[PDB]
Design an enzyme around this catalytic site. Sequence first.
Site, short mmCIF file in Angstrom:
data_model
loop_
_atom_site.label_atom_id
_atom_site.label_comp_id
_atom_site.label_asym_id
_atom_site.label_seq_id
_atom_site.Cartn_x
_atom_site.Cartn_y
_atom_site.Cartn_z
N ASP A 170 55.68 68.00 51.56
CA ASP A 170 56.86 68.41 52.33
C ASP A 170 58.02 68.56 51.37
O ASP A 170 57.84 68.35 50.18
CB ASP A 170 57.18 67.44 53.47
CG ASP A 170 57.74 66.11 52.98
OD1 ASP A 170 58.86 65.74 53.44
OD2 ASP A 170 57.06 65.46 52.14
N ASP A 202 62.09 67.99 52.06
CA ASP A 202 63.16 67.03 52.23
C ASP A 202 62.73 65.59 52.05
O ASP A 202 61.74 65.13 52.65
CB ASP A 202 63.79 67.22 53.60
CG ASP A 202 64.56 68.52 53.69
OD1 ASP A 202 65.33 68.79 52.73
OD2 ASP A 202 64.42 69.26 54.71
N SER A 221 71.05 73.27 67.44
CA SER A 221 71.57 73.30 66.08
C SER A 221 71.51 74.72 65.54
O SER A 221 72.48 75.22 64.98
CB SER A 221 70.78 72.37 65.15
OG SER A 221 69.98 71.46 65.89
MG LIG Z 1 60.87 64.77 54.73
#
Ligand SMILES: [Mg+2]
Length: 273
Positions: free
Chosen positions: A25, A27, A93
């Site tokens: 992933d 982030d 968002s």
């Molecule tokens: Mg993450």
Amino acid sequence: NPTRVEEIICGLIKGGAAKLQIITDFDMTLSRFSYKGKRCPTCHNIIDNCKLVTDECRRKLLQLKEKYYAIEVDPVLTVEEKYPYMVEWYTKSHGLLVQQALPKAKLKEIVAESDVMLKEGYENFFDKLQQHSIPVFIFSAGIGDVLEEVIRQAGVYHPNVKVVSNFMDFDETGVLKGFKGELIHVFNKHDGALRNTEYFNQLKDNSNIILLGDSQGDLRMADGVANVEHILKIGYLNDRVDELLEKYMDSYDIVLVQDESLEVANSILQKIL
Ligand SMILES: [Mg+2]
């Protein structure tokens, strides 16, 4: 188990570069959780906090990001139940980003002037993998366009790097109209893995896998892999540590508590490649 771990790694070394692929992933896994005692932004945070979003819109975004985070980490709600609110979160968002009418052409600067940071030892990570043409699959619930700009500017968007995330759709003004595809979010990575069957079927021989993640969700990213023979799961536990540590210990093969480097993966890579 320390022995179960070395059994796996020895499987990896044995297969070498010919059999290896990377799933990961973005982030808080390639990017840092914190630096110099200050929190680092997520892809979404990069956009929230930039100069192309009004004071009023960022207030609406934080009002959101407080309400919906509270629900995400609720101990009594089952994930069955959380799911719609996570869906609801992203929709609002993105709705607020859409109205702001952000220019495709202005991303380059926005990323440049954020406090986004990559884990220590990333050049060495991305450069070793490129040098042996090891397939890298970056699967992210963040924002593909920003993710991509972070790694291009860091100089590590190599031809072996496939990025799959929530990508922006623009109109002919080069101005945001929404998001392509079906939403990737923390709770549904499995559904996303299976949707990427074309990719993995080309890697029928790449049967040794290293998965890198930082959430419980991240554990499901391998579900579309064609042949699994050996697989090592590395988990970055950066926050909610005392809550989740026994869980991670029980599902990732290696847990790294608040570890802002890639030195462990690099040293394993050292032995394999
Ligand atoms: Mg993450």
